[PDB]
Design a protein around this ligand. Sequence first.
Ligand SMILES: *[C@H]1O[C@H](CO)[C@H](O)[C@H](O)[C@H]1NC(C)=O
Ligand SMILES: [Mg+2]
Ligand SMILES: [Mg+2]
Ligand SMILES: [Mg+2]
Ligand SMILES: [Mg+2]
Ligand SMILES: [Mg+2]
Ligand SMILES: [Mg+2]
Ligand SMILES: [Mg+2]
Ligand SMILES: [Mg+2]
Ligand SMILES: [Mg+2]
Ligand SMILES: [Mg+2]
Ligand SMILES: [Mg+2]
Ligand SMILES: [Mg+2]
Ligand SMILES: [Mg+2]
Ligand SMILES: [Mg+2]
Ligand SMILES: [Mg+2]
Ligand SMILES: [Mg+2]
Ligand SMILES: [Mg+2]
Ligand SMILES: [Mg+2]
Ligand SMILES: [Mg+2]
Ligand SMILES: [Mg+2]
Ligand SMILES: [Mg+2]
Ligand SMILES: [Mg+2]
Ligand SMILES: [Mg+2]
Ligand SMILES: [Mg+2]
Ligand SMILES: [Mg+2]
Ligand SMILES: [Mg+2]
Ligand SMILES: [Mg+2]
Ligand SMILES: [Mg+2]
Ligand SMILES: [Mg+2]
Ligand SMILES: [Mg+2]
Ligand SMILES: [Mg+2]
Ligand SMILES: [Mg+2]
Ligand SMILES: [Mg+2]
Ligand SMILES: [Mg+2]
Ligand SMILES: [Mg+2]
Ligand SMILES: [Mg+2]
Lengths: 103, 117, 150, 19, 142, 110, 48, 56
Amino acid sequence: MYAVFQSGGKQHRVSEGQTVRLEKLDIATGETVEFAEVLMIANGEEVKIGVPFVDGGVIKAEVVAHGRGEKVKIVKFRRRKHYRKQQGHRQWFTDVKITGISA
Amino acid sequence: ARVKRGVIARARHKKILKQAKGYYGARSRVYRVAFQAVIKAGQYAYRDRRQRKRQFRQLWIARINAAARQNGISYSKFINGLKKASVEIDRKILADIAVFDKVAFTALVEKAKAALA
Amino acid sequence: VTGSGKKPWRQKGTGRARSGSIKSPIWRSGGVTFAARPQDHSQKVNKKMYRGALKSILSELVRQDRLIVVEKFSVEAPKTKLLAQKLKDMALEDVLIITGELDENLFLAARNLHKVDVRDATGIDPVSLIAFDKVVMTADAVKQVEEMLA
Amino acid sequence: GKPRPYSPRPTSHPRPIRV
Amino acid sequence: MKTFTAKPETVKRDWYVVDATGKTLGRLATELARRLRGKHKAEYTPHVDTGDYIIVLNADKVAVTGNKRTDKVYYHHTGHIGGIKQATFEEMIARRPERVIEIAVKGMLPKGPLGRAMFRKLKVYAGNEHNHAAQQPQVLDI
Amino acid sequence: METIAKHRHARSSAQKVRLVADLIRGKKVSQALDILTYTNKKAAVLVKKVLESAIANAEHNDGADIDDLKVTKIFVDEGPSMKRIMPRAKGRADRILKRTSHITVVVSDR
Amino acid sequence: MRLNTLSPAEGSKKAGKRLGRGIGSGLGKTGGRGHKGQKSRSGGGVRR
Amino acid sequence: AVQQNKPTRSKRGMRRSHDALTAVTSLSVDKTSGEKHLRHHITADGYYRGRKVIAK
RNA sequence: CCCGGCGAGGGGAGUGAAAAAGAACCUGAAACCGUGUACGUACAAGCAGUGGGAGCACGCUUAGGCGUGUGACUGCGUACC
RNA sequence: UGUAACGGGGCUAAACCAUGCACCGAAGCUGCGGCAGCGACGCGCGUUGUUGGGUAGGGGAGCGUUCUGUAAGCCUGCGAAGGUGUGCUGUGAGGCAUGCUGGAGGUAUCAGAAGUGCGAAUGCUGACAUAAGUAACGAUAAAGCGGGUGAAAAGCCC
Ligand SMILES: *[C@H]1O[C@H](CO)[C@H](O)[C@H](O)[C@H]1NC(C)=O
Ligand SMILES: [Mg+2]
Ligand SMILES: [Mg+2]
Ligand SMILES: [Mg+2]
Ligand SMILES: [Mg+2]
Ligand SMILES: [Mg+2]
Ligand SMILES: [Mg+2]
Ligand SMILES: [Mg+2]
Ligand SMILES: [Mg+2]
Ligand SMILES: [Mg+2]
Ligand SMILES: [Mg+2]
Ligand SMILES: [Mg+2]
Ligand SMILES: [Mg+2]
Ligand SMILES: [Mg+2]
Ligand SMILES: [Mg+2]
Ligand SMILES: [Mg+2]
Ligand SMILES: [Mg+2]
Ligand SMILES: [Mg+2]
Ligand SMILES: [Mg+2]
Ligand SMILES: [Mg+2]
Ligand SMILES: [Mg+2]
Ligand SMILES: [Mg+2]
Ligand SMILES: [Mg+2]
Ligand SMILES: [Mg+2]
Ligand SMILES: [Mg+2]
Ligand SMILES: [Mg+2]
Ligand SMILES: [Mg+2]
Ligand SMILES: [Mg+2]
Ligand SMILES: [Mg+2]
Ligand SMILES: [Mg+2]
Ligand SMILES: [Mg+2]
Ligand SMILES: [Mg+2]
Ligand SMILES: [Mg+2]
Ligand SMILES: [Mg+2]
Ligand SMILES: [Mg+2]
Ligand SMILES: [Mg+2]
Ligand SMILES: [Mg+2]
């Protein structure tokens, strides 16, 4: 059984036990989060197409880690125009392990 | 107060050359060429971060169109039907379902078709 | 730079970059572009500004217990062992001793010792006050300093 | 490093005159 | 997660047989191109050939509209000065009927190594008999 | 037991010597000596002496039976070049490079 | 108050303009002189 | 006529792909002396096809 | 002591803390040129990267994903001053 | 030069005119996370709005290098500088740790001073490439053989 929930501006098809990485959440490590707006749930022939959210669908997850992603180098270079700019970036993320999914 | 540039200059060139590993010929051995290549790689990476978002959506749409048509509806009509039904699953997830769960995808198609009806 | 003013090669036809002097700074063994000359780095410190800075330093020393005001500081003979003994007894290792009548024996006894400098009240300098950990001052010196700085 | 250039030597062909 | 990508070592292509009799050239070629490329499969990956093997029959009877049967001209150059050669549609059909379909499909496939690989899956026969019965092609209306 | 012999500063460009070296690479010392014997190259003469020296070293210092020895590693490194001046027409000088080479032959039972 | 604790009042010491030291500096290449002309030339400029 | 661009080490090595020397296929063995020699050549000890053609 | 032309050069032995401190000698960068190993490469068109990405090899602390190396195929892409 | 006046394939619509309703489509807009400038508002921070493509050029704030004091301190043969890998780390110039190499220097901090940063200047000096194992080996008066010496002989001796 898997579920689709929109978190951090993006959606995710997850199944209990799958650790997912979402946009940084202001939630302590040990805490548990609940995503109420579950777009869809599926148990074989059972398929809950939320319109837009599956009534009573709730995904329970525990925060597992908060960290910065791989360093990206932003290079800007205008040729023949004496212009060149450099910038780094490490996007913040939050890993959440799905404790449970409730129809 | 004379300053020698050997130690510092060496480090700067080593830095650029390290970023040019894997490049063909002079691009990975010669600083003048490696430098230009490393800059161009950065320009391409910047431009391609945006393109990655474009290409994947393109891929998702094509997969949805294929799966939808197999269920007897076109992509344009499926998306329209989905919105009328108020379903808000993104194209990324629709594509994932279209490949891994065809029964579920068939359900979305029927819902979309009913919304049009 | 030693050399002649002969143009190394003709201006045109050789296919090489134009040259005019073997002493050019773009050349090995050439002259320094902006070669240095003897410089005088002395700055002007307004008398008031100088004296004011001294008073600020003296004040911090008092607030920080870095000024040991003693009536008399002297040694019987110009012997290093004597002053070393006295300083350990007073429990000061690094100290700038200012005296009203710079004693000759005291000047000699402290000469070898490197953490100890003996100066008259008219030889105090701002850096020495800040540098040395303690600034022992004789009764005479304190009045002299106050009167001089006034 | 490059050596001191040579003075004008005999030339094989006349330069074309464009005129 | 990451979007699934078709894997060439696991892709499952199928065999189909189509009849070109009466089918308009371009309209038929487009469907072949789509199915040859794998654009009808939800597992389609632009860098993997997920298409299917398609056998075409009666390539000599494919149809064209208007006056293309005589006016459509297939040009080619031989790499020799003044080497431009021109063959009309009727001429091509009589001399090399299979080429008429092949050219259309090849022109509609991606240009590059993968496109060439996709083209290898199209078996165009000028008649109504083929020799791929072991592959058991499944009739496919087009 | 990898015994090594080296002819350092051997007058001969590495490119030329490398031609001969590629022939005996991985060949039994005996087969190598024969191939060198009938190779019409100056480098063959150079390599043979180094190969012979290596074989001698294995026997004298390492007591290795010559019958088992094989050319495990053979490579030619460029040596210091001797700079020379070759006069040309019209008073122009063209430097000449007298390229040397370092010949390292390695012999071992395995 | 030690020799390695004294500091200048904020604003007292301003770093000078170092020309011709890269794009990042902002005074690289032409070094503020612009492009060509008499003013861009070393020793260039009209009299008062 | 000279190169407009320096050739690469790859191209240099590609041209030299045909420069490899080949060794003699096999040496022949004299029936009498037993020495090895280039086929159709006298041995170093002056034996050809079992006959001492030249002395010493 | 050994190979070698009573060679050059080298392999041992010995000296030294060290001989990859052996006199072409402190350290010993880079261009440049090699040997070995892994992967790719002989139906394939262009600033040689970048964004996707299969397979293979390797080292890992579930048998596991991961890390490292390579990069078929594919989107975009005509150096710098 | 070659089709060469839809980008191509192809098209009788996959052309054109009308009407309508979907969808695709950008670094635009929105969502989610983060950073910065400026202005308001409260209490130093918070909160709210808004802005952040840039050449010449102006303004501001930094990194690093050598040298002086701090430092007769601190680090260092239980391995300094330099070299060369690796991992981590900051928005950047960077920083930090560590394996190996190296074999004796290095230097926190906060200040001070500059020969303080290079890819270009047909730049200067040295080194090493490419063409390339290519052209050429300098009068077309000319060599052949035997013997000798030698590790080796077309070239030396006879
Ligand atoms: C050589 O070049 C000069 C100019 O530099 C003259 O043109 C001369 O005529 C040339 N030589 C010949 C033989 O024509
Ligand atoms: Mg110095
Ligand atoms: Mg490298
Ligand atoms: Mg000088
Ligand atoms: Mg005065
Ligand atoms: Mg030069
Ligand atoms: Mg394309
Ligand atoms: Mg002459
Ligand atoms: Mg500017
Ligand atoms: Mg200019
Ligand atoms: Mg102008
Ligand atoms: Mg101007
Ligand atoms: Mg001037
Ligand atoms: Mg040109
Ligand atoms: Mg050749
Ligand atoms: Mg020797
Ligand atoms: Mg050395
Ligand atoms: Mg090196
Ligand atoms: Mg072909
Ligand atoms: Mg192939
Ligand atoms: Mg090509
Ligand atoms: Mg392209
Ligand atoms: Mg024509
Ligand atoms: Mg977008
Ligand atoms: Mg925007
Ligand atoms: Mg800006
Ligand atoms: Mg020493
Ligand atoms: Mg200091
Ligand atoms: Mg300078
Ligand atoms: Mg520049
Ligand atoms: Mg050269
Ligand atoms: Mg040639
Ligand atoms: Mg030739
Ligand atoms: Mg010739
Ligand atoms: Mg003779
Ligand atoms: Mg002769
Ligand atoms: Mg004679």
